[PDB]
Design a protein around this ligand. Structure first.
Ligand SMILES: NCCOc1c(Cl)cc(C(=O)O)cc1Cl
Length: 247
């Protein structure tokens, strides 16, 4: 996250921190994710497509710091790693950039809700806030494009939804942005998602209720004028979500 503020998991209790274990034993941060039910975290396919082996992953919930422990945090393995069959990446755009991680403790259980661990609601079918709506993003992503390390503390910021018409101007992203994606940005171009924020939530208060409207997906640079953050439009993937979380 460029700009915004440091935050704690109690403010974003659906946030999931997703790591990968390497041969040798080192663990690196991969991407964010969001708990949508006790057994399920939703994230982005581009995060996993080069290393699709579920055994390589570690998922934390209730965690506020990148490489240290938080009281009440819970650690999970990935029981099933579901990537979208139709995922693709062009020069800039990722398409169908959505993944599901079925999580379980070492004891075989799903998450236990607490004050620092909670599910976030899915939107209803094609139900998105109007452009101009303020929504929040959360992640451990870069604070500046020049950074090579991620922040140690979780961050959040607020961005506004940008119309498709605005986002599809040739000097924005033209027709690379599709109907299955949402753009969001800062009107003054000072705050944004950045590398490392992928997979994490874009949350909007929708009909008075906190809703997973988007998933951090792609963009050109970070907090660059005329280049909004691009998000998987969750409400266009409900059948996919439902079918893979059924069985
Ligand atoms: N400012 C939105 C674009 O931020 C990024 C970047 Cl710089 C890289 C990646 C990546 O996949 O490396 C993803 C996002 Cl959302």
């Amino acid at each position: 996250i460029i700009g915004g503020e440091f935050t704690t998991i109690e403010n974003q209790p659906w946030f999931a921190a997703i790591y990968r274990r390497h041969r040798g034993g080192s663990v690196t941060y991969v991407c964010g994710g969001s708990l949508i039910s006790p057994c399920w975290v939703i994230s982005a396919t581009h995060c996993f497509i080069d290393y699709p082996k579920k055994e390589d992953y570690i998922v934390y919930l209730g965690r506020s710091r990148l490489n240290s422990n938080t009281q009440g945090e819970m650690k999970f393995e990935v029981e099933n790693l579901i990537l979208h069959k139709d995922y693709s990446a062009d020069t800039l755009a990722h398409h169908n950039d959505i993944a599901l991680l079925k999580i379980r403790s070492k004891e075989g259980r799903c998450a236990q809700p607490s004050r620092t661990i909670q599910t976030i609601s899915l939107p209803s079918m094609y139900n998105d806030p109007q452009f101009g709506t303020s929504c929040e993003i959360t992640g451990f992503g870069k604070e500046n494009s020049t950074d090579y390390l991620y922040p140690e503390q979780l961050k959040m910021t607020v961005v506004k939804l940008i119309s498709h018409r605005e986002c599809q101007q040739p000097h924005y992203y033209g027709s690379e942005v599709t109907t299955k994606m949402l753009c969001a940005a800062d009107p003054q171009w000072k705050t944004d998602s950045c590398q490392g924020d992928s997979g994490g939530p874009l949350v909007c208060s929708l009909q008075g209720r906190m809703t997973l409207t988007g998933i951090v997906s792609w963009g050109r640079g970070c907090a660059l004028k005329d280049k909004p953050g691009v998000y998987t439009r969750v409400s266009h993937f409900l059948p996919w979500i439902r079918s893979h979380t059924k069985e």
